[PDB]
Amino acid sequence: TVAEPDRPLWFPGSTPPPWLDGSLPGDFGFDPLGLGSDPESLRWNVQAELVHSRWAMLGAAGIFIPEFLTKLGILNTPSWYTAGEQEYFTDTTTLFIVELVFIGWAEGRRWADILNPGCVNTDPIFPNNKLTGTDVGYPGGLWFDPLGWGSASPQKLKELRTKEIKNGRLAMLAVMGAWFQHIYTGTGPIDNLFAHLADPGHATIFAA
Amino acid sequence: ASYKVKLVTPDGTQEFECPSDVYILDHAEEVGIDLPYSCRAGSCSSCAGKVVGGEVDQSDGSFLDDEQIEAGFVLTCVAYPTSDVVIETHKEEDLTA
Amino acid sequence: PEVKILVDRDPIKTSFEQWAKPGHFSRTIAKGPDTTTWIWNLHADAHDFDSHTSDLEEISRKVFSAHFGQLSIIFLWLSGMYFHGARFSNYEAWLNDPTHIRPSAQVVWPIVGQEILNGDVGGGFRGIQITSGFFQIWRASGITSELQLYCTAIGALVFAALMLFAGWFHYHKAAPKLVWFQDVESMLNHHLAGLLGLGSLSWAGHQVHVSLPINQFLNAGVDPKEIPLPHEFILNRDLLAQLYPSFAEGATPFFTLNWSKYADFLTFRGGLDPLTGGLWLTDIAHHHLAIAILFLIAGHMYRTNWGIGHGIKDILEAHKGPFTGQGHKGLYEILTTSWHAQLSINLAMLGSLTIIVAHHMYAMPPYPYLATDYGTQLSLFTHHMWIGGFLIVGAAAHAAIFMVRDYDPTTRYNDLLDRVLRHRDAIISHLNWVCIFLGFHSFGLYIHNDTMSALGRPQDMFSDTAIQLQPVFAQWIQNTHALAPGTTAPGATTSTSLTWGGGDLVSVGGKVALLPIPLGTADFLVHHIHAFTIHVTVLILLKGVLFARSSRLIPDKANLGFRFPCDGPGRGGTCQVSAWDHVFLGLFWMYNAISVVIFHFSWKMQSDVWGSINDQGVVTHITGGNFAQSSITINGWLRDFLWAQASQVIQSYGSSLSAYGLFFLGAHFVWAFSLMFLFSGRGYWQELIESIVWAHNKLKVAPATQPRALSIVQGRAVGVTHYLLGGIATTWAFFLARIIAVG
Amino acid sequence: RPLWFASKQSLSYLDGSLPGDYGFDPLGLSDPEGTGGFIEPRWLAYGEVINGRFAMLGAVGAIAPEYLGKVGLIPQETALAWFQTGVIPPAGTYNYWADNYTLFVLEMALMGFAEHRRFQDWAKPGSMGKQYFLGLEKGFGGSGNPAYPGGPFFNPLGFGKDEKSLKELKLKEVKNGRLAMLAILGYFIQGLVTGVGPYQNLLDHVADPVNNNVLTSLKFH
Amino acid sequence: MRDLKTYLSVAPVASTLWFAALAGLLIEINRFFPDALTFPFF
Numbered sequence A: 001t002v003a004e005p006d007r008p009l010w011f012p013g014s015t016p017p018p019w020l021d022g023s024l025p026g027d028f029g030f031d032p033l034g035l036g037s038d039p040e041s042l043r044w045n046v047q048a049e050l051v052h053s054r055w056a057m058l059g060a061a062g063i064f065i066p067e068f069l070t071k072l073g074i075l076n077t078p079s080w081y082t083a084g085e086q087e088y089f090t091d092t093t094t095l096f097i098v099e100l101v102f103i104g105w106a107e108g109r110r111w112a113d114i115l116n117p118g119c120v121n122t123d124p125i126f127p128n129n130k131l132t133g134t135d136v137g138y139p140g141g142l143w144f145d146p147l148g149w150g151s152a153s154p155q156k157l158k159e160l161r162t163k164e165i166k167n168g169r170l171a172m173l174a175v176m177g178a179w180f181q182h183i184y185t186g187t188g189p190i191d192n193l194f195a196h197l198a199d200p201g202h203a204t205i206f207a208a
Numbered sequence B: 001a002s003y004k005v006k007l008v009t010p011d012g013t014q015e016f017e018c019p020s021d022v023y024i025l026d027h028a029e030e031v032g033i034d035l036p037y038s039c040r041a042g043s044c045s046s047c048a049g050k051v052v053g054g055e056v057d058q059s060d061g062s063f064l065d066d067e068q069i070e071a072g073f074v075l076t077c078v079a080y081p082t083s084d085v086v087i088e089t090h091k092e093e094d095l096t097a
Numbered sequence C: 001p002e003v004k005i006l007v008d009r010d011p012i013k014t015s016f017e018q019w020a021k022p023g024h025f026s027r028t029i030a031k032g033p034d035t036t037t038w039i040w041n042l043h044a045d046a047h048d049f050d051s052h053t054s055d056l057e058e059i060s061r062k063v064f065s066a067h068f069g070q071l072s073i074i075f076l077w078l079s080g081m082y083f084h085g086a087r088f089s090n091y092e093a094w095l096n097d098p099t100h101i102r103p104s105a106q107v108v109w110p111i112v113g114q115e116i117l118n119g120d121v122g123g124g125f126r127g128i129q130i131t132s133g134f135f136q137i138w139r140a141s142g143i144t145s146e147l148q149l150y151c152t153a154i155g156a157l158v159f160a161a162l163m164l165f166a167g168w169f170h171y172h173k174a175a176p177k178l179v180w181f182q183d184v185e186s187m188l189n190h191h192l193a194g195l196l197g198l199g200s201l202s203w204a205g206h207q208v209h210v211s212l213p214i215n216q217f218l219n220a221g222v223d224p225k226e227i228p229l230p231h232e233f234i235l236n237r238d239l240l241a242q243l244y245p246s247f248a249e250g251a252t253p254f255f256t257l258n259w260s261k262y263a264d265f266l267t268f269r270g271g272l273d274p275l276t277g278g279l280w281l282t283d284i285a286h287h288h289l290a291i292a293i294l295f296l297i298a299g300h301m302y303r304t305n306w307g308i309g310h311g312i313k314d315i316l317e318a319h320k321g322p323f324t325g326q327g328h329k330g331l332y333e334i335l336t337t338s339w340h341a342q343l344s345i346n347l348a349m350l351g352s353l354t355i356i357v358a359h360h361m362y363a364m365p366p367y368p369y370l371a372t373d374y375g376t377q378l379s380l381f382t383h384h385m386w387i388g389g390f391l392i393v394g395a396a397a398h399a400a401i402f403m404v405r406d407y408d409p410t411t412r413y414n415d416l417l418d419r420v421l422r423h424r425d426a427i428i429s430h431l432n433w434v435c436i437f438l439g440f441h442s443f444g445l446y447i448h449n450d451t452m453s454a455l456g457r458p459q460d461m462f463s464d465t466a467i468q469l470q471p472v473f474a475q476w477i478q479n480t481h482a483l484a485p486g487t488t489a490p491g492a493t494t495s496t497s498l499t500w501g502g503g504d505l506v507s508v509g510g511k512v513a514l515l516p517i518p519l520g521t522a523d524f525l526v527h528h529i530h531a532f533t534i535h536v537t538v539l540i541l542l543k544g545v546l547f548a549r550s551s552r553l554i555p556d557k558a559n560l561g562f563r564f565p566c567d568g569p570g571r572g573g574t575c576q577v578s579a580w581d582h583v584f585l586g587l588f589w590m591y592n593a594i595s596v597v598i599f600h601f602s603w604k605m606q607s608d609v610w611g612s613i614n615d616q617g618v619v620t621h622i623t624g625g626n627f628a629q630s631s632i633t634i635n636g637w638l639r640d641f642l643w644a645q646a647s648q649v650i651q652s653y654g655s656s657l658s659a660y661g662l663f664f665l666g667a668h669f670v671w672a673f674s675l676m677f678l679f680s681g682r683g684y685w686q687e688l689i690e691s692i693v694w695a696h697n698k699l700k701v702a703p704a705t706q707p708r709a710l711s712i713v714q715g716r717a718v719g720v721t722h723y724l725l726g727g728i729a730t731t732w733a734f735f736l737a738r739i740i741a742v743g
Numbered sequence D: 001r002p003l004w005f006a007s008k009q010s011l012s013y014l015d016g017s018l019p020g021d022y023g024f025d026p027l028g029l030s031d032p033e034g035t036g037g038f039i040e041p042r043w044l045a046y047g048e049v050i051n052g053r054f055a056m057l058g059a060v061g062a063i064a065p066e067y068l069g070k071v072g073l074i075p076q077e078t079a080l081a082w083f084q085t086g087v088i089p090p091a092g093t094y095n096y097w098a099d100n101y102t103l104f105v106l107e108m109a110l111m112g113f114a115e116h117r118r119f120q121d122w123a124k125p126g127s128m129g130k131q132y133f134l135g136l137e138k139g140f141g142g143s144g145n146p147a148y149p150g151g152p153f154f155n156p157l158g159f160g161k162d163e164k165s166l167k168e169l170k171l172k173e174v175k176n177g178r179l180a181m182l183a184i185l186g187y188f189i190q191g192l193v194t195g196v197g198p199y200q201n202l203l204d205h206v207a208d209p210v211n212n213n214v215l216t217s218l219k220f221h
Numbered sequence E: 001m002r003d004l005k006t007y008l009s010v011a012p013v014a015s016t017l018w019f020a021a022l023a024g025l026l027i028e029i030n031r032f033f034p035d036a037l038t039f040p041f042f
C-alpha cells in the first residue's frame, strides 16, 4: 500500500501493467500473459507463489547442503533422486499415509485462513493461545514467530518480505535445475558443478 | 438508469422519466402522452420514429432494413433508452417513403 | 496508377472479450438465443464474410488471413505425415526390399483387443498398411534415413507456426487495403513467373542433384545405408561425373549453347523404366526445366509499372464481333469487384485439373515402384476423382451466389452475360433434349442387352460377338499415338505411355506394370454412359445458375435470396426453386457420375491390365479378363463385380482387415440414416417435440432455450451430407479391403 | 543532385534531406502512402545505416587474417579464409577455447544485452538513461535520432559539432557503407564460385586476366 | 484472463473436456480389469 510508481522493471523501458502498481513486495512488473489482472486472482496467486517459494527453499537446502557435504566425506546420504527407494523402518505407503494426515490438517487450517482471514486464529483446546500475525500468508504467533523477528512496521517488514520472495524464486529455479540436470545426465549436481568448473569452455550442456 | 426522454410530437414536446431496462412506449404510456402503435412486438412500422441526439438500444428489433438502424429510424416499442434521448414520434411514412 | 504496397496499422485489436460473446460478427446472432435454432445459424453463417458486412476492404482482409490459417493447417498435417514416417513406420526395411514389404506408418495401442489391427506388414513390423503412396514419394526424393524424415517434420512444424503468425499479423497489425488486392496484373505476373516458374526450376535443381544420383545408386543395387549422403554429391563432384560424364564440363555447355553435351541426364525417352515401373527420372528433370522456362517467360505479359506489357481491359475490349455485340467489355470491372465470380472460375478449373491428374497418373506412372503397388494406384485415382467432382460442383454454387448477390446491369453492364440471359430458354431446352437422347442410347442398350441375354437370344445382343459397336476414332487415335515415335516425333524413342500400344509390356517383380489397353464394344458403351451422366449434371447446375434471379413461375426470385426453402405451396407448389436447391440436387448426380467412373476404372484395370506374369511370359490377370463379355449387361455388373469382389470385405472379421469390415457396415448404416432426413419434413418433427417438451415440463426439468425442429434447408443439407458420407465410405471400405486382400 | 534511374514517383518523396539521396528507388519502397510494419521509411533508413556499419566491420574483418598470413610471424594455423574458420563447418573448422556452440550462446547473450537496449532506444526514445544500470546510464541517454545517439560513449572525440560537419561526415559514412555492402556480397558469391578466398582470388587475378570471370563458370565444385 | 475463463466454459469446450476425462477414466478401468462380463465381487 505504498504505490512505488518508478520501481525497477524487468524490461527497462516497458510500461508496467495497470494491476501491478508497486504495493506488493518483490514487485517488478512481470506479467506479460496478464495472469494476474483480477484482484482475487492476484491474491490467490500471491499465496501460491509464497508457499511454493518456501517449499522450494526447504527442498533446495535438503538437496544442496547434503550433496555438497556428501561429496566431501561428511555424511553418507544417498542421491536425493535415488533416495526415494532406499527403504526405512517401514515401507513408503504407510509413511505417506501418516504424512498425509499430519500435513493435510495444517493445509486445511491454512485453507480456512486464506478464504476467511483470522477465523481460525486461536486454539479450540486452549483458547488463551492466539497467533499474533495479522496478514494472510504471514501467520506469526509464537509457533511461526517466537523471535518476534517478523512483526514490525513498513520499510522494515516490506524489505524482509521482498528478500524472502527473491530467495524463494531462486530456490524454485534451483531445484528445477537439479531435476533437469540429473535427468539429462546420470550424475549428481555437485559433480556437474565441478566438471563445468574444471572445464567451463567445454563442459557445458553441449557435450552430448 | 432512468434517463429523461424527449419526444417531439404534433401535440408538442414532453418529458418523462423512465429506467433504461424499459421500452419507450410503455413509459410514454405511464405519464400519459399518447403515441401511435399497432403491434407492440416490433413487426410493423406504426411506432416508427427518429432521433435528435444520443442513440437507443435496438437489440430486440426485427423486420427492419439492414440500414433503418444506421440512418435514424427506430421502433418505440422494442427500444431501450440508453441515454437522455430526444426523439421523434408519428414518423411511419417518412420512414415508409 | 503505379503499383505499390498499401497497408493500415492496427485495424483490429487482439482481445478475448469477443470469444466470450458468441456470434459477434452478425447483429442477429449477437443478440443471443431464444430457441435452439440460434446454435445452428451461428455455425451456418460463420464464414459468410460478405454477409456480415458491406465493405469490400473488410471482406478481402478476412479472406487473406483465413487463407493463412488454412495453410498453417496443411503444414501441420504434412508435419504429422513426416513424423509418422520417421517414428512409427517400416520405411527403411521397405527401402531394402520394396516388392515384398507392404508400407505401414500407423500403429495402435493394445487397449481393448484392438491390437489385432496391427497386422503383419513384413520387415519385422506390425501395423496398418497405408495407401497414400508416401514411400514412393520419399524414394523418388532420395530420402534414405529416418533422420531426414524427422528433419522435414520439424521444418514443417516451424512453417506451420510461421503461417499462423502471418495470419494473425496481416489481420490485426498490418492489413492491406482494397487497392492492393485489386491489382491483378502484378498478381498474375508473380504467380506465373515467381510461384510456378521459380518453383519448378528449384525442383528441377533438386532432382538433378539428389533424386537422380541417389536413385541411380539405389537401382544399381547398393545398400541404402552405404550410399553417400546427398550433400557429398555437391561437395565432391567426381561422384557425379562417374554417373554422368557431362557433369565434368559443368555449365560450360549451358553458355557455349552446346546443350547437346547434357544429353547424359536430360533425355526425351518416353515410356517406363523397366526396373522400377516408373517414368525415367532423366525425363522428369528435363520436363521441369522446360516448364520452368515456359512459365518464367509467361510471367512477363501484363503491364505493371514500366509501360511494357498488356492491359487486361484492352485485351477484353478488343474482342467483339457481329454475333456477340460488344462482348468482353465490362468483365474487368466484374472480375475485380466480386470474390464469388473469381471463386467460381477458380473452382471449375481446379476440379477439372484434379480429374486430369487422376488420368495422367494412372496412365504414365511417375513414381518408382508405384505401378505394381495396386492398392496405392486405386486409392490415388479414386481420391482425386472425388476431389475434382466436389470442386466442380462448388463452382456452380458460387456462380449462383454471384448471380443473386452481385450481378447488376445498372452499374456494371456486360454484353455477353446479358445475351445469355436473354436466350436461356433455348439453351436449357437443347441441353434437356440432348440429355434425354443420350440417356436413351446408352442405358437403353444395357437394358436391351439384359433382356436379350435373359430371353436366350445372345446373337441379338450389342457385343463383340453379335452386334459390334467399335469406337473407331479412339482406336485410330491410339494407333496414331503408337506410330508417333519416329514418324511425327523423330526425337522420341518409345511413345508417351504403354497404353497406346506397340506390343511393349513392362513387368516388375513378376507383376504387370503396364501394357496396351484394348478398346472394344464395352468401352464404347461405358463412355457413352459417362457422357450421359456429365450432361445431366451440367443441365441441373446450369439451370440453377441461369434462373437464379427470376423465372416465368416466380418473377422476382432474386429478392428471396440464394438459399430459401420455397415460395409457398401456391402456383402449384414451389419447393426447391432456389439455386441452393439446384446445388443440392447436383450433388447426388455428381455422386452418381463419379461412382460409375471409379467402378469402370477398377473393373477394367483388374480385368485387362493388372495381374501376374510368368517367366515363360504368360500374363494371368486378377480377374480373368471378363470385362469384355460381362460388362455389357447390368446383371454382369451386379454378379461379376459387386457380389464377387465384396467377398474380401465380408470375410475380414478376425484378420487385420477387420476395420474395413466394420466400416462397410457403419457406412451402410449412415447412408440409410440419411433417408430419414431426406424423405420427411419438419412439421411432423416439431409436433412430436411438443409432446416431449410437455413431458419435461411435468417434472420442472424443461430447458429455457426452447427446442425446435431443424430448418427446412438444414433438413435437406443434413440429408445430403449423410447420404454422401455413407455412400463414399462404403465404396472406400470395399475398395481398400478388396485390393489389399488380393496381391 | 545527380539522379540515377529516377522517376516521377520516387522523386516525389525523395526530397533530399537524407545523405546520399540519389532519387534511385525503381521499386518504390520508400513511398509513405501505405506504410505499415518494417516498411516505414525511417526504419528503412535506419536499417541501411546499420547494415552498412556492420558491413564495413565485417568486410574489413573477413579479409584481414589471410592478408597477415603472408606478412609477419602471424602463425598460419591462425591464417584461414573467412569461410574456413568455423562459419561453415562443412568447409573447415577450428579448435578455439570453446565449443562453437557455447560460443554461439555466449555471443548471443552479449549481443542480446546490446541490441535489446539499442531497440528500446528506438521505440521509446530516451528510455535507457533512466533505469539503474550500475552507472552506465548517464551515457546512454540518446540524441533524439536513433542512428546517431551520441553521448560520452559513441562520440568520445567530439567530431562534428556543427551542421556542415555532420552532413559531410554522414554522406561519407553511408557511401562507404554501401561500398562495403557490395563488397560483402561479392565476397559471398566469389567464395562460392571459385571457392578459394577473396584475397587469394585477387592475387590470382592480378597476375593474369586470362581467368577473370567467365572462366570460373565451369564451377569446379 | 476472466474472458478466457468464461470462454473455456462455453458448451463445446466444456463437453470436450468432460468427455476426454471420462474417456481416460473408462480406458484406464478397462486396462486394469479387462474382459468383464459379470460383477465378480459380491
Ligand code: CLA
Binding pocket: A010, A020, A024, A025, A026, A027, A028, A029, A030, A031, A034, A035, A036, A042, A045, A046, A048, A049, A052, A169, A172, A173, A176
Ligand atoms: C508457480 C510459480 C510462480 C507463480 C505462481 C508466480 C506468480 C506471480 N509472479 Mg512470478 N516468477 C516465478 C514463478 C512464479 N511466479 C519464477 C520462477 C520467476 C523467476 C524467473 C518469476 C519472476 C517474476 C517476476 C520478475 C515478477 C513475477 C511476478 C508474479 C506475480 C504476477 C501475477 C502472475 O504472474 O500471474 C499468475 C501466475 C501464475 C498463474 C503461475 C504461472 C505458471 C505457468 C503456467 C508456468 C508455465 C511453465 C513455465 C513457463 C516453464 C517451466 C519450465 C522451466 C521451470 C524450466 C504473481 C503472483 C511479478 C510481481 O510483481 O511479483 C509480485 C513480477 O514482476 N514473477
Ligand code: CLA
Binding pocket: C043, C044, C045, C046, C047, C048, C049, C390, C391, C392, C393, C394, C395, C397, C401, C562, C563, C580, C583, C721
Ligand atoms: C475454396 C473452396 C470453398 C470456399 C472458400 C467456400 C466458401 C464459402 N462457401 Mg462453399 N462450396 C465449396 C467450396 C468452397 N466454399 C464446394 C466444393 C461446394 C460443393 C459442396 C460448395 C458449396 C457451397 C454451398 C451450397 C454454400 C456454400 C457457402 C459458402 C460460404 C459460407 C460457408 C460456411 O461458412 O458454411 C459453414 C460450414 C460448415 C457448417 C461446415 C459443414 C460441415 C460439413 C457439412 C461436414 C463434412 C463432413 C466431413 C468432411 C467429414 C465428416 C467428419 C465427421 C464424421 C466428424 C463461404 C463464403 C454457403 C453460402 O451461402 O454462400 C454465401 C452455401 O450455402 N458453399
Ligand SMILES: CC(/C=C/C=C(C)/C=C/[C@@]12O[C@]1(C)C[C@@H](O)CC2(C)C)=C\C=C\C=C(C)\C=C\C=C(C)\C=C\[C@@]12O[C@]1(C)C[C@@H](O)CC2(C)C
Binding pocket: A030, A031, A032, A033, A034, A035, A052, A053, A055, A056, A057, A058, A059, A060, A061, A062, A063, A079, A080, A081, A083, A084, A171, A172, A173, A175, A176
Ligand atoms: C520453477 C517453478 C516455477 C516457474 C514459473 C514461471 C517461470 C512462470 C512465469 C510466468 O508465469 C509468470 C509468473 C507470469 C506470466 O505472465 C509469464 C510467465 C513466464 C508465464 C517452480 C518450482 C518450484 C519448486 C519447488 C516448489 C520445489 C520443492 C522441492 C522439494 C520440497 C524437495 C523435496 C525433496 O524431498 C524430495 C521429495 C526427495 C528428497 O530426498 C530430496 C528433496 C529433493 C529435497
Ligand SMILES: CC1=C[C@H](O)CC(C)(C)[C@H]1/C=C/C(C)=C/C=C/C(C)=C/C=C/C=C(C)/C=C/C=C(C)/C=C/C1=C(C)C[C@H](O)CC1(C)C
Binding pocket: D024, D025, D026, D027, D028, D029, D051, D052, D054, D055, D057, D058, D059, D061, D062, D081, D082, D083, D085, D087, D181, D182, D184, D185
Ligand atoms: C536500393 C534498392 C531499392 C530498389 O528499388 C530495389 C533494389 C535494387 C533491390 C535496391 C537494393 C539494392 C541492393 C544492392 C541491396 C543490397 C544491399 C546489400 C549488399 C547489403 C549487404 C549487407 C551486408 C552485411 C550486413 C554483412 C555483414 C557481414 C559481416 C558482419 C561479416 C561477418 C563475418 C566475418 C567478419 C568473418 C567471419 O569469418 C564470418 C562472418 C561472421 C560472416
Ligand code: SF4
Binding pocket: C565, C566, C567, C568, C569, C570, C573, C574, C575, C576, C681, C712
Ligand atoms: S413448406 Fe415445404 S412442402 Fe410446403 S411449399 Fe414449402 S417446401 Fe413445399
Ligand code: FES
Binding pocket: B036, B037, B038, B039, B040, B041, B042, B043, B044, B045, B046, B047, B048, B075, B076, B077, B078
Ligand atoms: S406497434 Fe408496430 S412496432 Fe410497436
Ligand SMILES: [Ca+2]
Binding pocket: C004, C005, C006, D028, D029, D030, D031, D032, D033, D034, D035, D039
Ligand atoms: Ca510504401
